[PDB]
Design a protein that fits this description.
The complex is a heterodimer of chains A (5) and B (335). With 5 residues, chain A is largely without helices or strands. Chain A has no helices and no strands. Chain B has 2 domains: 134 residues, D-Maltodextrin-Binding Protein, domain 2 (3-Layer(aba) Sandwich), CATH 3.40.190.10; 192 residues, Periplasmic binding protein-like II (D-Maltodextrin-Binding Protein, domain 2), CATH 3.40.190.10. Chain B is built from 9 helices and 13 strands. In chain B, helix 4 crosses helix 9. Chain B is globular. The chains are: A little secondary structure (5), B alpha+beta (335). At the A-B interface, loops of A face helix 2 of B. The complex binds a molecule of 6 linked components (NAG-NDG-BMA-MAN-MAN-MAN), a molecule of 3 linked components (NAG-NAG-MAN), a molecule of 2 linked components (NAG-NDG) and zinc ion (3 copies). The PDB classes it as transport protein. Keywords: Lactoferrin, C-lobe, transport protein.
Chain lengths: 5, 335
């Protein structure tokens, strides 16, 4: 998550 | 509790941020990170409040919930009755540039040539170009299209970084910040100017600001715009004066982003900061100018007249526009 989606 | 923490990317932006902090009486303070993606993370964690981003990075930040706050606005002719801060944004022209002497090189013969990009994931330097090439090629092997390139942010051992040069000492080769000699709009154009690459993917404005005496920089002093040509999508070549009829796409202006829960407060402070250090600002030549950094585009693009309010309180998808958003999505399907 840090490319969250 | 009312101060804003700006995030600087790299040593040079940090130094300029420190100066702005000093003159602002610490109303603005600084956090620094090695890359733009790391600055986004600091913002998400709440350790930094904001930073100005290119459209491609706005897409990344957007999916993580950050929002557009104010946009860069450069000097324009068509909507001149309105003040800059309230004036709609025009967007900039993404172009492909080559040297006149490299005759015969056109959009249709870029295969196996050398390329210069601002940085991986950016609008004019990567997303637009590579998206067009992937489509036209029916292949996700964009890393095998050019023979060698300098594309900050890619694997340092790959051909996408083969042409990057690092800093004064050869360190930080291909890092996506200003320590890399060929990073950003200015760096990618320099990469072409010194003939390290055959084509540079930048924006219309970069060509003008670095030719015919506009830069004084050692490598740019003797550059004339007639020695350059733009590559048009219809296989043709044109003078840099015809950008409106020979560009790859029009790009959304760079904009300041922040966590939605901090947007209103960041907006307020920034508006006061530019009344002081902006173009016609109270302190500009005298003490400090937010929008200058000797052609290095540190924190903000040097051709910025002011930061403008958005109007329509746009989401990140609305700000970037559906044309551009679908373009990125499609290209990402590859990576
Ligand atoms: C590709 O990208 C290019 C760069 O981004 C861009 O090139 C052009 O972009 C704009 C828009 O087309 C050009 O247009 C001019 O806009 C000026 C404002 O930016 C405006 O000019 C100045 O005129 C004078 C002096 O030139 C000064 O103005 C007056 O009024 C004040 C009172 O308010 C009074 O005090 C003065 O007596 C003047 O009467 C003023 O400032 C000056 O600063 C200049 C800095 O060097 C200096 O040259 C000049 O001497 C003045 O001292 C005004 O700013 C004009 O009316 C123009 O219409 C840019 O000039 C041009 N940039 C370049 C590098 O060529 C392209 O448009 C873009 N192409 C595409 C397709 O997108
Ligand atoms: C690479 O090739 C892609 C596939 O054609 C391009 O993408 C798309 O093409 C268009 C342009 O935005 C999109 O089409 C429309 O969206 C809706 C419904 O389709 C219409 O209402 C609207 O008028 C457009 O006709 C496609 O949705 C999109 N295809 C896919 C699968 O998403 C893409 O533009 C191109 N890349 C570059 C850089 O040119
Ligand atoms: C630091 O920011 C503060 C807050 O805006 C500025 O000081 C004041 O400015 C306004 C104009 O008079 C007042 O309405 C505020 O109430 C007042 N706030 C405080 C806490 O005193 C100041 O201009 C800023 N300094 C700089 C250089 O940016
Ligand atoms: Zn950009
Ligand atoms: Zn010849
Ligand atoms: Zn809306």
């Amino acid at each position: 998550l840090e490319a969250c989606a | 509790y009312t101060r804003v923490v700006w995030c600087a990317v790299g040593p040079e932006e940090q130094k300029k941020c420190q100066q702005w902090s000093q003159q602002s009486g610490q109303n603005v303070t600084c956090a620094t990170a090695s890359t733009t993606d790391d600055c986004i993370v600091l913002v998400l964690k709440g350790e930094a409040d904001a930073l100005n981003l290119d459209g491609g990075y706005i897409y990344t930040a957007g999916k993580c919930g950050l929002v557009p706050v104010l946009a860069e606005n450069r000097k324009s002719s068509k909507h001149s009755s309105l003040d800059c801060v309230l004036r709609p944004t025009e967007g900039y022209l993404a172009v492909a540039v080559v040297k006149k002497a490299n005759e015969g090189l056109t959009w249709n013969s870029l295969k196996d040539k050398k390329s210069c990009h601002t940085a991986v994931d950016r609008t004019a330097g990567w997303n637009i170009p590579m998206g067009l090439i992937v489509n036209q090629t029916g292949s996700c092997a964009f890393d095998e299209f050019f023979s060698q390139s300098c594309a900050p942010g890619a694997d340092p051992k790959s051909r996408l970084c083969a042409l990057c040069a690092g800093d004064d000492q050869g360190l930080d080769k291909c890092v996506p910040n200003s320590k890399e000699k060929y990073y950003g709009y200015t760096g990618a154009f320099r990469c072409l100017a010194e003939d390290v690459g055959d084509v540079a993917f930048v924006k219309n404005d970069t060509v003008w600001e670095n030719t015919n005496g506009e830069s004084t920089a050692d490598w740019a002093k003797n550059l004339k715009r007639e020695d350059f040509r733009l590559l048009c999508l219809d296989g043709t070549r044109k003078p840099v004066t015809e950008a409106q009829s020979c560009h790859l796409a029009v790009a959304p202006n760079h904009a300041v982003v922040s966590r939605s829960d901090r947007a209103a407060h960041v907006e307020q402070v920034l508006l006061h900061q530019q009344a002081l250090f902006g173009k016609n600002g109270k302190n500009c030549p005298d003490k400090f100018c937010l929008f200058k950094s000797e052609t290095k585009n540190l924190l903000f693009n040097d051709n910025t007249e002011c930061l403008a309010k958005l109007g329509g309180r746009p989401t990140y998808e609305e700000y970037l526009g559906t044309e551009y958003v679908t373009a990125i999505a499609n290209l990402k399907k590859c990576s």
